Design a protein around this ligand. Structure first.
Ligand code: SF4
Ligand SMILES: [Zn+2]
Ligand SMILES: [Zn+2]
Ligand SMILES: [Zn+2]
Ligand SMILES: [Zn+2]
Lengths: 355, 417, 752
């Protein structure tokens, strides 16, 4: 009787994903993850302790964020002992923040949090940020309270005025002030103050936070942006780099001012212009071109085919596991459905079918 | 406040502060302004986010907390004092700050003072301890008892404020001023001692309430509505996102900077299906060892070329003298700084930038000549044994610099000429 | 949203509605059709006031009777709540119809709440406030200032402007809040008390306290300008019997006796001086008493009676004053020998309890004072004060109290008793004797109400059982049923903590009150719930002394220092004003989310009109059974009388009152269905009382919850928080809990 429970669970899951929309979603991102390292995360209540798992999950989050969206800079400020401590400036290299987080590994989480100080200096760090960049902050929190020097509502008003959004991933339960932050910052939405139920749910939440977010019509910033593809050289001689001032065998060359750099996707240090590859911009095209869900045909009706169109395996036989791409009119197995919907980003049935 | 570009450029003390924090910043700044004489405003003009980050790092302060509650009495007692917590006590209790400042710089020592403080009954009163005449306290600290009492009265006077009638229990109990009933129970009324006086639990409870009020008014610092208050949001319309979807019209330009026929391909197709059903031999695939030898030549040539590519797969190890290595790295660094500032001036595009562009052009020319003179030095220091490698190492930044000079000259001829 | 009942159009200011609200409206309209009274119990977590207000407004507008509306509550807080919701409803109706209908409705309260005379405003005793207002606007002052403008007896310019403009000119139509009325009277310099006193005949709906309906002194005026066939509704008056008891109960202290002696001597010497200088006024008063005129006969409206009418007007004496007290000196000697008799009876050595008839017999045995003068005393004293012009009335308030006592005890004999005990405080340095007057019944004061009005609605949220109130009060209702909670999912989690962390039971008994182990348990789960509580938590001990002891000795352990590190702690001050500042502090602390804890008595001033919601109502630490003080002779006499009357088990009634107080404590968590909260029961003895408990409360009380400890209480609370931290699909409640207009239509057709 487990298949009926699985079916009704899949129905209640798919009721949320019935509506799939091609919203304009931010690509030039600006993501900040502040960390609290206080007495609360010293609890071993989840194995091994909250501090260790948020360290590991932040490592994964950095990797996933830079993989999916390499067109953003990442800054991390830790919270400790009534002080918020900047440990990671916004940068194109994830490895810097990886090393900073590795430093955060060995140190000891202790103290009390101050979202006022944390968000204030996060605002100040987010101040010299260009218009197209979408300023947004992830906040992790384990306390049920917050010691603060002054008002939080002035900070809330300033953050709303400066067009920065937040998303809170609280640990224990809901905190009303964090709900207020999420609602007021997020145009009244309640889809940003999220509480886990276990570590797997925390993993899923982090994966959810990886994704780009849609933007609002009223928050209109539709413009152009100057861009430059550089050229890579492979020279015999080591050559001084502009950024780190040291001898480099290879390195890309600046398209505009003909200097050289060491890493991409990065902006020029000399002509001060952003340099990318077409792979980097095409990386988010699945977000730009979403994929429709695939429908299982019912077991009662007559079937177009009895084996999987894509992976080429036999469909198993009570119910019918034939997920149909209505855009290509072909049914598929669950494994192929998962792979095409998540790993792949094209429908080979729609590739074979001519338009 | 201290947030404008002008304020950040003005704070010379903060500039010196993060200067003294770094060491390569003395190196860079010394070469930039001490050695090259660049305008230090334009030096700091790039490092404005770093300056603001340093300022905001230095600028934060903690929130209030119950420091006396965190004080523990801990046989004997050994003082283990923390200066930040001492100042926390000072800020939380200006009476204790005053008692420090009129006694320690006048009469006795700081650890002696804090031993007297922990001995004092004023400490117990300010903490969550009921005062007792069995305790003797410290007389010097306990002279401040009435001063703290009148501080409490003045603070309560400040803390008084009018109350909203929506929640005013005083208005609630002033509903009926002529309630004539019976005297309520001793159990539920505030109990007293035998002689009618109170024990003082009402005093300690109003004191901790005063602590709460002081904390919330510290929050409420420098740094009608009931219609909104009584809204029942549970029976209201759900909020829906106004996020805009996006379509995509698709019309791409063809790639810019003989035709086969169905009959002919069908004829060839018929012929090759005939050949396919006719025969297929794996053994004929073996080549003629001469055109195959040319294939060997091509393959081996590709291997040699890409192997020489792979032959040049901390920086690289070099046989430079270390001092000259540092000097040339320094010259490369300051040349890069000059070039970046010149590009900042050039891409700015103002007539106000013109003298700056000219002067940085002169500085770039000077850097060019100094690079050449350095090349003369490594010339007569090596006999061009590795002075060639020195020139090649400093080459690409020089090429970019002189390209920028040519660009400046060309735009000068474009506009002026 | 707007729909039709069978003949009734009705508008709801929200698109959504609850089926429980629909059934509530159905039964209320059934009651209004059939005439009389009914008792309905509903879970207070659903919206009540807006729904009943909408039904009443629709009833008045649609039906050609257009009967007025009488709604009464306990506090200014509840009154302001009703005002705000009424304003919202009428605004919605105005928007829906596209125009504003003619409407009038206001509240009723004290000058202490209201008198905007800034000089009078700076007093704290509302009695003094009212007295000063009479002193400078009594009409006598106005006449004296009119004949002599040089006289320095000023008049209230607010009152002067209200003299200038007319009663309909006082306000535009509609409903105005206390705050809106404050703004309006601030603009126009008007006395809102006087305004309200002239709005009485004009308001379509009138709202005031239960006291203004129950106490005869502040109720005869309300009965004067009220329509006999209006609509009467009551809300959350399940503890109104106490108000009924105090409506006719009184106490006697030594210092009050001293003040009465001093006031009588002052009045006697004033009467001697007046007889010396001008006996014309005294002779005029004496002959007016010979004709037998009364307070309404002689006094006008602008002058008020000094001794207000202590008894119900159905029982007053309306004949002439006897000649034995008719003269001023005769009446002074009468009062003085009454005082002397009271001083003789004052000095007993033990507990004395006799019938008022027996007291009257003893009095007529010793002195020679009869029930007719002993009833006429208050009226005669008011007339003597009016004639005497003795407006410095400080020494004579004890005289008012003693005349009130004399009139009250001379009025009734059954269901009333006098208690004399030689100690005002038993456990003091010295005993202090006391006379305590009581009213053993409670249904006395409701008789004018029930026999003056038929359309009277008695309903609440925490009334259980329904029949016990017609048992205790001689009245009957047309229908008696409750409402179950039609809940889609669980939102309230009650627990019964029958044992501590060490499986050690806990109780609130005053003998075992200073038990260190019970202290250790109490502080233990107090700490644990403080650590796991996100926003706001309240604690309700049964008694203030119980608090003061147990908080002082946790202060000795320094547990409060640990509690400091997570939330603030707020304690019910004996000062209501400091308590108001404290609750504001708690409000702002839960507003900024740093978190705070309230400490208030179960019967304390917080518990009777303050709600807590969505961060304020999140978790409540109810402490033990809130039993009353056991060794009250007053309570025992009540128990004896009610058992003799209605065959009531005494311990069962005590448990009744305790659980009803507990329900009143715990009912202030769930404002809307979106809210959630957890309930604790911190006594072992509660397990037998789920059958006593209200039905919708106990329906969430599962059988596994009947005996829990700290550990699984903590685990279940954490899991409840985890549960309530999740979103919910609207499809699971779109037709079972939240109803659209079409949902209500479909349900109505299904009923059809
Ligand atoms: S005249 Fe009006 S404002 Fe003045 S005391 Fe009387 S009610 Fe208050
Ligand atoms: Zn480099
Ligand atoms: Zn460049
Ligand atoms: Zn497949
Ligand atoms: Zn397809």
């Amino acid at each position: 009787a487990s298949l009926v429970a699985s079916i009704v669970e899949a129905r209640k899951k798919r009721t949320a994903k019935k509506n799939i929309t091609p919203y304009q979603r931010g690509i030039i991102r600006s993501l900040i993850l502040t960390l609290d390292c206080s007495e609360a995360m010293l609890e071993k209540d989840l194995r091994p302790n909250r501090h260790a798992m948020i360290i590991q999950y932040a490592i994964d989050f950095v990797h996933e964020f830079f993989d999916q969206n390499p067109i953003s800079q990442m800054g991390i400020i830790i919270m400790r002992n009534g002080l918020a401590q900047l440990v990671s400036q916004v940068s194109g290299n994830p490895q810097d923040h990886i090393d900073a987080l590795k430093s955060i590994r060995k140190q000891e989480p202790k103290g009390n949090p101050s979202l006022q100080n944390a968000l204030e200096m996060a605002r100040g760090l987010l101040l010299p940020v260009p218009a197209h960049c979408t300023r947004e902050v992830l906040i992790v929190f384990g306390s049920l309270s917050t010691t603060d020097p002054g008002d939080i509502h002035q900070t809330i008003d300033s953050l709303v005025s400066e067009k920065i959004r937040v998303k809170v991933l609280g640990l224990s339960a809901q905190v009303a002030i964090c709900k207020e932050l999420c609602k007021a910052t997020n145009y009244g939405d309640e889809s940003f103050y999220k509480i886990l139920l276990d570590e797997t749910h925390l993993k899923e939440l982090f994966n959810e936070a990886v994704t780009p977010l849609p933007v609002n019509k009223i928050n209109k910033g539709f413009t152009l942006v100057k861009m430059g593809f550089p050229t890579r050289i492979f020279e015999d001689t080591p050559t001084f780099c502009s950024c780190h001032s040291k001898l480099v065998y290879g390195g890309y060359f600046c398209p505009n001012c003909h200097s050289k750099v060491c890493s991409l996707p990065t902006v020029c240090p000399c002509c001060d212009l952003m340099l990318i590859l077409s792979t980097h911009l095409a990386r988010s095209y699945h977000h730009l071109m979403p994929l429709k869900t695939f429908a299982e045909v019912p077991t009662t009706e007559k079937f177009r085919s009895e084996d999987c169109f894509s992976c080429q395996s036999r469909f198993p036989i009570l119910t019918s596991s034939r997920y149909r791409c209505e855009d290509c009119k072909q049914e598929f197995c669950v494994d192929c459905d998962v792979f095409i919907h998540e790993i792949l980003h094209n429908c080979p049935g729609c590739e074979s079918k001519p338009v | 406040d201290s947030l404008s570009k002008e304020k950040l450029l003005t704070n010379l003390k903060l500039q010196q502060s993060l200067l003294k924090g770094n060491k390569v910043l003395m190196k860079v700044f010394q070469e930039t302004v001490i050695n090259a004489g660049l305008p230090p405003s334009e030096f700091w003009s790039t490092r404005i986010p770093l300056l603001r980050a340093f300022a905001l790092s230095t600028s934060q302060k903690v929130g209030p907390y119950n420091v006396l509650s965190t004080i523990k009495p801990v046989n004997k007692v050994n003082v283990n004092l923390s200066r930040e917590k001492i100042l926390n006590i000072f800020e939380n209790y200006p009476i204790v700050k005053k008692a420090y400042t009129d006694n320690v710089p006048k009469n006795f020592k700081e650890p002696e003072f804090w031993a007297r403080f922990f001995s004092s009954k004023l400490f117990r009163k300010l903490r969550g301890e009921k005062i007792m005449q069995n305790d003797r306290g410290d007389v010097i600290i306990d002279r401040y008892l009435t001063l703290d009492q009148e501080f409490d009265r003045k603070d309560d006077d400040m803390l008084l404020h009018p109350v909203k009638k929506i929640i005013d229990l005083d208005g609630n109990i002033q509903d009926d001023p002529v309630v004539r009933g019976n005297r309520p129970d001793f159990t539920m009324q505030p109990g007293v001692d035998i002689n009618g006086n109170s024990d003082g639990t009402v005093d300690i409870l109003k004191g901790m309430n005063r602590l709460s009020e002081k904390m919330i008014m510290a929050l409420k610092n420098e740094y009608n509505d009931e219609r909104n208050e009584l809204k029942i949001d549970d029976l209201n319309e759900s909020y829906k996102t106004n996020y805009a979807i996006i379509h995509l019209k698709r019309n791409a330009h063809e790639k810019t900077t003989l035709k086969v026929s169905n009959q002919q391909m069908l004829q060839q197709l018929s012929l090759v299906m005939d050949n396919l059903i006719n025969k297929l031999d794996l053994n004929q695939v073996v080549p003629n060892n001469e055109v195959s030898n040319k294939i060997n030549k091509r393959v081996i040539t590709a291997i040699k070329i890409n192997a020489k590519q792979a032959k040049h797969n901390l920086e690289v190890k070099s046989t430079l003298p270390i001092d000259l290595l540092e000097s040339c790295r320094m010259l490369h660094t300051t040349c890069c700084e000059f070039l970046k500032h010149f590009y900042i001036h050039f891409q700015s595009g103002e007539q106000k930038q013109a003298s700056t562009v000219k002067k940085l052009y002169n500085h770039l020319k000077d850097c060019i000549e100094k690079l050449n003179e350095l090349f003369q030095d490594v010339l007569n220091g090596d006999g061009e044994s590795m002075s060639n490698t020195c020139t090649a190492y400093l080459k690409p930044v020089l090429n970019s610099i002189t390209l920028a000079t040519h660009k400046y000259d060309e735009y000068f001829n474009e506009y002026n000429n | 949203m707007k729909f039709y009942i069978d003949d009734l159009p009705v508008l709801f200011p929200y698109p959504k509605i609850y089926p429980e609200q629909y059934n509530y409206m159905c039964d209320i309209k059934k009651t209004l059709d059939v005439g009389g009274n009914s008792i309905l119990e509903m879970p207070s977590g659903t919206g009540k006031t807006v729904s009943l207000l909408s039904l009443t407004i629709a009833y008045q507008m649609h039906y050609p009777e257009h009967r007025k509306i009488i709604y009464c509550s306990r506090t200014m807080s509840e009154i302001e709540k009703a005002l705000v919701e009424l304003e919202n409803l009428m605004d919605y109706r105005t928007k829906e119809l596209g125009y504003q209908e003619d409407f009038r409705g206001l509240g009723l309260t004290s000058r202490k709440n209201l008198c905007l005379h800034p000089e009078v405003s700076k007093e704290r005793k509302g009695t003094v406030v009212d007295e000063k207002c009479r002193r400078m606007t009594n009409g006598q002052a106005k006449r004296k200032l009119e004949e002599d403008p040089e006289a320095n007896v000023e008049l209230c310019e607010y009152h002067e402007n209200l003299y200038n403009i007319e009663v309909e000119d006082y306000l535009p139509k509609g409903v105005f809040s206390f705050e809106k009325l404050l703004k309006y009277c601030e603009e126009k310099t008007l006395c809102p008390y006087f305004i309200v006193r002239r709005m009485i005949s004009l308001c379509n709906i009138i709202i005031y306290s239960y006291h203004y309906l129950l106490d005869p002194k502040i109720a005869e005026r309300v009965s004067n300008e009220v329509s006999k066939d209006s609509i009467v509704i009551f809300d959350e008056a399940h503890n109104i019997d106490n108000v009924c008891i105090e409506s006719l109960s009184l106490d006697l202290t030594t210092d009050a006796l001293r003040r009465a002696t001093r006031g009588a001597n002052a009045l006697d010497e004033r009467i001697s001086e007046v007889r010396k200088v001008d006996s014309q006024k005294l002779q005029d008063e004496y002959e007016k008493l010979v004709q037998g005129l009364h307070s309404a006969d002689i006094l006008t409206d602008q002058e008020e009676p000094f001794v207000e009418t202590p008894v119900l007007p159905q029982d007053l004496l309306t004949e002439a004053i006897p000649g034995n007290i008719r003269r001023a000196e005769h009446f002074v000697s009468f009062l003085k020998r009454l005082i002397e008799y009271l001083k003789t009876r004052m000095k007993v050595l033990h507990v004395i309890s006799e019938t008022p008839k027996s007291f009257l017999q003893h009095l007529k045995q010793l002195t020679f004072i009869e029930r007719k003068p002993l009833r006429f005393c208050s009226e005669r004293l008011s007339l003597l004060v009016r004639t005497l012009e003795v407006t410095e009335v400080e020494d004579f308030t004890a005289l008012k109290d003693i005349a009130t006592f004399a009139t009250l005890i001379s009025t009734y004999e059954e269901g009333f008793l006098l208690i004399i005990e030689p100690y005002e405080i038993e456990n003091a340095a010295v005993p202090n004797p006391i006379m305590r007057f009581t009213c053993l019944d409670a249904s006395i004061a409701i008789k004018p109400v029930f026999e003056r009005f038929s359309s009277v609605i008695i309903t609440s949220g925490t009334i259980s059982p329904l029949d016990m109130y017609p048992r205790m009060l001689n009245f009957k209702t047309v229908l008696q049923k409750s409402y179950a909670m039609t809940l889609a999912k669980k939102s309230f989690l009650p627990m019964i903590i029958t044992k501590g962390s060490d499986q050690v039971a806990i109780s609130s008994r005053f003998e075992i009150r200073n038990d260190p182990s019970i202290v250790r348990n109490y502080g233990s789960m107090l700490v644990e719930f403080a650590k796991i509580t996100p926003d706001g938590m309240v604690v309700f001990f049964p008694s203030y002394l119980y608090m003061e002891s147990i908080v002082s000795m946790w202060q000795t352990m320094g547990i409060l220092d640990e509690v400091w590190k997570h939330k603030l702690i707020l304690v019910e001050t004996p000062d209501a004003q400091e308590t108001s500042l404290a609750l504001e502090t708690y409000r702002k602390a839960c507003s900024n989310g740093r978190g705070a804890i309230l400490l208030s008595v179960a019967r304390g001033k917080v518990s009777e009109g303050i709600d807590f919601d969505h961060q304020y109502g999140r978790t409540v630490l109810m402490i033990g059974i809130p039993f009353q003080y056991t060794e009250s002779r007053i309570l025992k006499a009540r128990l004896e009388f009610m058992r003799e009357n209605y065959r009531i088990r005494e311990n069962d009634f005590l448990s009744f009152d305790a659980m009803r107080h507990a329900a009143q404590c715990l009912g202030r968590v769930l404002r809307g269905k979106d809210d959630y909260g957890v309930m604790v029961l911190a006594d072992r003895r509660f397990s037998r009382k789920r059958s006593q408990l209200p039905k919708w409360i106990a329906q969430g009380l599962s059988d596994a919850d009947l005996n829990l400890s700290t550990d699984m209480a903590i685990s279940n609370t954490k899991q409840f928080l985890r549960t309530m931290a999740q979103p919910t699909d609207p499809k699971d409640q779109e037709g079972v809990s939240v109803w659209s207009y079409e949902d209500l239509i479909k349900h109505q057709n299904s009923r059809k």
